[PDB]
Amino acid sequence: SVTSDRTYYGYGDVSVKNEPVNVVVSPFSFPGANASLSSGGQGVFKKPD
């Protein structure tokens, strides 16, 4: 009578949500406060973070 269609199934799901990286920024204001930059001046400025 019944000629079974021999076909069973298995399934799965994958969730890719985020991007690998977050670039958190703290911008710099290099002449800063309690220091001074002059025209034609020479030197170095550094922000560690």
Return the one option of Ca ion, another protein, none that residue 48 interacts with (CB less than 5 to 8 A, by type). none
Stretch that binds another protein, among 2-10, 11-19, 20-28, 29-37 (CB under 8 A): 29-37
Measured between its terminal Cα atoms, the distance across the chain in Å is 77
Find the shortest distance in angstroms from Cβ 32 to another protein.
Answer: 11
Q: How far, in whole angstroms, is CA 29 from its chain's centroid?
A: 23
Stretch that binds Ca ion, among 1-9, 20-28, 29-37, 41-49 (CB under 5 A): 41-49
Measured distance CA(5)–CA(8) in Å, rounded: 9
Asked if residue 20 binds another protein (CB under 8 A), the reply is no
